[PDB]
Amino acid sequence: ASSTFYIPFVNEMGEGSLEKAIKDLNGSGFKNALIVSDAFMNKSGVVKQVADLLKAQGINSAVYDGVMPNPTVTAVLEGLKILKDNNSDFVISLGGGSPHDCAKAIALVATNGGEVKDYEGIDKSKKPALPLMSINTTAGTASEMTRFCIITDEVRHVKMAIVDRHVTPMVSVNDPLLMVGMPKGLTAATGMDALTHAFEAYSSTAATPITDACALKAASMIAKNLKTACDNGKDMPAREAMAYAQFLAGMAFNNASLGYVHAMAHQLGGYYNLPHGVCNAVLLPHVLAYNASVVAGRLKDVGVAMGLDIANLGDKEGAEATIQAVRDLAASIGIPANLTELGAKKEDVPLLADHALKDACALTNPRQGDQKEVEELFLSAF
Amino acid sequence: ASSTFYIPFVNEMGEGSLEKAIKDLNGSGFKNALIVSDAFMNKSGVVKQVADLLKAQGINSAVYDGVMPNPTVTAVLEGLKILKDNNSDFVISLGGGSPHDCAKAIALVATNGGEVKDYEGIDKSKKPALPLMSINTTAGTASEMTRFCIITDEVRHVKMAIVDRHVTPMVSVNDPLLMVGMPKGLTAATGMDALTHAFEAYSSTAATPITDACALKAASMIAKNLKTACDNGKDMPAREAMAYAQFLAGMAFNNASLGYVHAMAHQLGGYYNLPHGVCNAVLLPHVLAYNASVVAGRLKDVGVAMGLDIANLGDKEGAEATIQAVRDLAASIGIPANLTELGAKKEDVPLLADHALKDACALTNPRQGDQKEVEELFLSAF
Numbered sequence: 001a002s003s004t005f006y007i008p009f010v011n012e013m014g015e016g017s018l019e020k021a022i023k024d025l026n027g028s029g030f031k032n033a034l035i036v037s038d039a040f041m042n043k044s045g046v047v048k049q050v051a052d053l054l055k056a057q058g059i060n061s062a063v064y065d066g067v068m069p070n071p072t073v074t075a076v077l078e079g080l081k082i083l084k085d086n087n088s089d090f091v092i093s094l095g096g097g098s099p100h101d102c103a104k105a106i107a108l109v110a111t112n113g114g115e116v117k118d119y120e121g122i123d124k125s126k127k128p129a130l131p132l133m134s135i136n137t138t139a140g141t142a143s144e145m146t147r148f149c150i151i152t153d154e155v156r157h158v159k160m161a162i163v164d165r166h167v168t169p170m171v172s173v174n175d176p177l178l179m180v181g182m183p184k185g186l187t188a189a190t191g192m193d194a195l196t197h198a199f200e201a202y203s204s205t206a207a208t209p210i211t212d213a214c215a216l217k218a219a220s221m222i223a224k225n226l227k228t229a230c231d232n233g234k235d236m237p238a239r240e241a242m243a244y245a246q247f248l249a250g251m252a253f254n255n256a257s258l259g260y261v262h263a264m265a266h267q268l269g270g271y272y273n274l275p276h277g278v279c280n281a282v283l284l285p286h287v288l289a290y291n292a293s294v295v296a297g298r299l300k301d302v303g304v305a306m307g308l309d310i311a312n313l314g315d316k317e318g319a320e321a322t323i324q325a326v327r328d329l330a331a332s333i334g335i336p337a338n339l340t341e342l343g344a345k346k347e348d349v350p351l352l353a354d355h356a357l358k359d360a361c362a363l364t365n366p367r368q369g370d371q372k373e374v375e376e377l378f379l380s381a382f
Numbered sequence: 383a384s385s386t387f388y389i390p391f392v393n394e395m396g397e398g399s400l401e402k403a404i405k406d407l408n409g410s411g412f413k414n415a416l417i418v419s420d421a422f423m424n425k426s427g428v429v430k431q432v433a434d435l436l437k438a439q440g441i442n443s444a445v446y447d448g449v450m451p452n453p454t455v456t457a458v459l460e461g462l463k464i465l466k467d468n469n470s471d472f473v474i475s476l477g478g479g480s481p482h483d484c485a486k487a488i489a490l491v492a493t494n495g496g497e498v499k500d501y502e503g504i505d506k507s508k509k510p511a512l513p514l515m516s517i518n519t520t521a522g523t524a525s526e527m528t529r530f531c532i533i534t535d536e537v538r539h540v541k542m543a544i545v546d547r548h549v550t551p552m553v554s555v556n557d558p559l560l561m562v563g564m565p566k567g568l569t570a571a572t573g574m575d576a577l578t579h580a581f582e583a584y585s586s587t588a589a590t591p592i593t594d595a596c597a598l599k600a601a602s603m604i605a606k607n608l609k610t611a612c613d614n615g616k617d618m619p620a621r622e623a624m625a626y627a628q629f630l631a632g633m634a635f636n637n638a639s640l641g642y643v644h645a646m647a648h649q650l651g652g653y654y655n656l657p658h659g660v661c662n663a664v665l666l667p668h669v670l671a672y673n674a675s676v677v678a679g680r681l682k683d684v685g686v687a688m689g690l691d692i693a694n695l696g697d698k699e700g701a702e703a704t705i706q707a708v709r710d711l712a713a714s715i716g717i718p719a720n721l722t723e724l725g726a727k728k729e730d731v732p733l734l735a736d737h738a739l740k741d742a743c744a745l746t747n748p749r750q751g752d753q754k755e756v757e758e759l760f761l762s763a764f
């Protein structure tokens with residue numbers, strides 16, 4: 001239906017895929033890698049691990065661990081500098097979403113024009129970014145496989161969006177071994193983010209038969225494995241399932257886009273720098289009820305995929321039960337009860353709702369609302 | 383077991399996807415294209431169509447329409463000659479699986495030099511093929527998105543399989559506008575080929591959560607639209623659904639690989655010069671029954687995705703009902719009833735089985751047999 005499916009040419013997954021991925025670099029002609037990650041990744045030795053595997057392949061590396069949650073333009077320039085001083089010939093992002101976005105920005109500018117803003121928009125760059133490999137460590141973002149790059153400009157205090165086929169990593173890596181170390185909180189929040197991606201992509205007005213297939217399979221796997229990974233981060237089968245699941249969710253949202261959960265969430269965790277993952281998790285149930293008036297039938301499909309015994313229910317009751325199941329799941333893994341517990345203030349709703357309707361994710365939401373409707377939706381999230 | 387998921391980074395689909403894909407070449411830098419197609423595509427004017435759209439973007443093009451079913455080394459060589467004399471900077475395949483494979487080979491050799499036979503096997507090429515855009519016109523092969531390139535050596539009558547991430551097209555195009563012209567025979571054939579891909583991918587020992595989801599969705603869409611597309615090729619929705627379906631089947635088989643149906647069918651064609659699509663179509667049900675002893679349960683899963691009322695049946699029964707549904711679907715769209723009609727001769731069975739066991743697709747079949755069993759499988763299809 002006049003659509004486009006974006007995704008990396010190569011996506012390595014499963015236990016041991018990291019070594020496989022690095023091993024595949026031998027003979028590639030790369031000599032100097034730029035490892036873009038965060039403080040924690042470098043501290044716990046994950047960076048070292050990569051650097052050594054790389055050395056065993058005759059490839060040296062330089063490290064930039066100055067990435068903070070919700071990347072910034074200063075982080076990028078910071079990486080470009082380190083990149084230049086080491087004359088890096090390729091980039092490797094390591095960690096959760098933040099490192100990938102920063103890395104995508106580094107690699108794009110590395111081979112293209114100047115500042116980041118010059119690429120704020122859709123397919124702005126004319127040249128492919130420097131080869132980029134993204135190694136994911138959380139089970140919920142999928143930023144390692146998206147063509148999205150959101151860099152925050154602390155000047156104008158506005159977050160720029162770079163939707164470009166050129167920021168799609170050349171190779172994505174989802175090795176569950178690097179995920180076993182996720183504490184319960186990050187596991188629950190990123191997993192609920194993955195679930196949100198499935199729900200919003202499946203509900204999107206830009207949905208295709210492909211995104212639908214991936215979205216439902218993702219919700220199914222998350223429904224059968226998120227609780228386990230939260231109650232036992234060492235359960236390798238559950239970790240591998242979530243890695244696959246979060247990728248499937250990405251296959252879906254990277255191409256069908258999202259909705260009001262994210263449009264609204266980006267405002268709480270944007271102006272109030274809250275952890276992306278949880279904001280979506282708490283908002284999800286409430287947005288589903290709102291959208292249920294238009295896509296009750298499809299919310300039921302998701303509930304059915306989730307293993308719920310509702311196939312015989314009408315779409316209305318099926319959607320409610322699915323909405324209830326999401327609430328029960330969130331509660332079972334420690335997700336906050338409402339925005340009140342997130343530190344949000346009801347007096348900020350009018351501002352949040354206005355900026356929410358402005359978010360690019362709001363465009364594909366199945367139900368379109370006005371200022372009043374988004375404000376009341378917010379207030380109900382408290 | 384860890385896995386890898388291969389796919390072009392950009393995949394354009396739906397009505398109008400052709401115009402979008404060509405428009406996106408603007409500012410790409412490509413000024414001279416080698417269009418690889420066949421006699422039909424050229425005479426019917428599809429080649430001119432594409433050539434003209436390229437012109438509107440200031441891109442010249444040279445055509446090679448010598449491709450025939452089961453692309454050969456000779457065809458590859460001729461195409462490289464035209465490429466050379468025109469110094470084409472990128473390749474565009476146009477048509478079904480034959481042009482895509484021929485184009486992948488031409489593109490791979492253009493940058494890697496040597497001969498086609500040198501790349502037979504896994505990831506043998508050292509450099510990425512010349513940029514390649516694949517425009518698919520049949521609804522069943524998906525070769526516009528795979529990392530497989532099958533070329534036939536006419537001199538010694540030998541099919542060579544090139545399994546290399548470097549042959550993955552840069553951009554795939556699936557515009558149902560180019561599939562509307564498929565005659566009922568080709569619609570039925572390629573449609574059954576896509577269904578075979580789904581079955582074999584779902585039955586494969588290299589299946590993953592991702593290939594499973596894609597395979598099942600492909601089977602569900604085919605069971606719902608193939609018959610409609612055959613009865614009336616002017617039905618755009620049907621054509622578009624078949625296009626997404628065949629792509630989804632490719633998402634599955636390019637990654638989990640195939641099985642005995644293709645292992646055997648590749649021989650019938652590479653010997654009696656029979657159409658790829660029809661060979662698998664007639665063999666499918668006989669191989670499914672053969673494999674039913676090991677994967678009856680998964681075979682039942684496909685049946686359910688196909689909408690069969692077998693959810694409440696046991697695996698053996700569910701599987702048998704699935705296989706019968708396949709036989710009935712094939713009959714309903716005019717697939718020849720057996721290998722005798724195709725012109726296959728029992729006297730050649732011993733050699734067909736021998737080579738079938740040596741086919742790369744055979745390694746993933748869920749049930750491994752021997753010379754005698756494969757010969758008997760063949761004869762059972764006469």
Ligand SMILES: NC(=O)c1ccc[n+]([C@@H]2O[C@H](COP(=O)([O-])OP(=O)(O)OC[C@H]3O[C@@H](n4cnc5c(N)ncnc54)[C@H](O)[C@@H]3O)[C@@H](O)[C@H]2O)c1
Nearest residue numbers: 040041069070096097098137138141148178179181182276
């Ligand atoms: N394109 C979009 O619209 C979109 C969608 C979803 C998320 N995002 C972006 O993605 C980012 C969210 O990334 P995220 O939640 O994966 O994490 P971050 O938010 O990437 O990292 C969070 C923290 O978890 C740590 N961590 C990562 N893996 C770990 C492990 N295995 N064990 C222990 N600690 C680990 C990090 O070191 C860090 O301290 C945000 O910047 C968000 O805005 C963008």
Ligand SMILES: NC(=O)c1ccc[n+]([C@@H]2O[C@H](COP(=O)([O-])OP(=O)(O)OC[C@H]3O[C@@H](n4cnc5c(N)ncnc54)[C@H](O)[C@@H]3O)[C@@H](O)[C@H]2O)c1
Nearest residue numbers: 422452478479480519520523525528530560561563564658
């Ligand atoms: N992943 C892979 O690499 C892969 C998978 C399966 C099959 N294959 C290969 O692909 C080939 C099979 O290709 P196929 O069945 O698509 O067909 P071809 O075999 O591409 O073409 C068959 C005939 O159909 C015609 N045709 C194609 N599109 C048409 C249209 N829109 N309208 C009217 N006629 C049209 C052709 O001009 C030709 O006469 C085999 O050679 C096989 O080995 C490759």
Ligand SMILES: [Fe+2]
Nearest residue numbers: 193197262280
């Ligand atoms: Fe998200």
Ligand SMILES: [Fe+2]
Nearest residue numbers: 575579644662
């Ligand atoms: Fe096939």
